[PDB]
């Protein structure tokens, strides 16, 4: 397929991975009686292992010669669920955490004792900030263009050189 890779649903090495993983569990299950708790624990692990291999095969992942799934991350849309969408999901959470943390440090500067607000957090106000993070892309860009994100270079302490 892409980069000489094979879809995991027709990879023979993927098929042997699934079989070897189950033979390894079945020989541990061969040492226990049917209704025992170790037998049910291993029978649930054989169900989980088979389910995972079935899902990967039908997902559009590509396997290598080694029979393991490989991720395509060049930007193509047929493979966006491996990096681009998990990445879009990450950056939304990361910017949320950043926007919310930034909003609280600016609040704490206007406090009676600014450093006491950072070791003893005003939890009702800090929870007010965490809820605000859901629209951080719009809130932060408007913050930028309204001249409130970036401070000018001449209000920042620098080393003499």
């Amino acid at each position: 397929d892409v980069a000489g890779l094979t879809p995991c649903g027709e990879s023979k090495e993927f098929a042997r991975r699934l079989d070897g993983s189950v033979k390894k569990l079945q020989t541990r299950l061969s040492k226990y009686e049917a209704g025992t708790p170790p037998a049910l624990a291993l029978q649930k692990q054989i169900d989980k292992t088979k389910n995972r291999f079935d899902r990967y095969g039908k997902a559009g992942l590509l396997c290598g010669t080694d029979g393991l799934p490989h991720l395509i991350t060049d930007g193509r849309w047929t493979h966006s669920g491996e990096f681009v969408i998990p990445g879009l999901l990450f950056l939304y959470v990361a910017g949320w955490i950043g926007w919310v943390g930034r909003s609280y440090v600016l609040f704490a500067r206007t406090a009676d004792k600014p450093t006491e607000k950072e070791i003893i957090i005003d939890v009702p106000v800090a929870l007010s900030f965490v809820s605000t993070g859901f629209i951080w892309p719009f809130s932060a860009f408007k913050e930028f263009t309204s001249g409130n994100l970036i401070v000018p270079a001449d209000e920042i302490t620098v080393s003499p050189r």
Binding site: K44, T132, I135, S139
Partner: protein, 194 residues
Amino acid sequence: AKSKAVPFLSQPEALDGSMAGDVGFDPFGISSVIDIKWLRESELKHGRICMLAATGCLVQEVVHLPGPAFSQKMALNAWAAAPRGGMISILVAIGLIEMISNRFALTATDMFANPNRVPGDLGFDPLSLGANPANRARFELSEVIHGRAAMMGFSGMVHQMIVSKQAPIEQLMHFKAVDSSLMKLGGAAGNLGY
């Protein structure tokens, strides 16, 4: 100075009997931590959503739009059956409604920035039904009460759909009791997993 709802507790501050549906019920003291304006905005919103949702379940049992994608009497099955494109259309339209009706004052730090903004009052009166100021207090009371009742009712209906794989009216008309041989609560750690 005791609560009227809970007679053995002290009456909570930020609850002064002005708001509709105010009977002194805040035993956990959330009103002392969270501004009552935000709490009433969220209560009216949750209640309005649940009025539509409870009505949605019952009417969806009775009446359907045409087509096989809309033929699910059980409302929890309708979630999966309904066309995904149109369901995400509903979601996107809700988001557009949320930003515009709130006028870009969406968050915990900028909703109610305008002193004119009132909790739950979005300017929505298309037919001017609240034009009469004599009906205002009882409309506010019965909106809050309908919202609370529908929150409880929809919660019950959803979890009765989970327990009994039946739609709400025909669960009442073809009732089957809980055997307890299925859907036992908890237990993920009692058997140590699996």
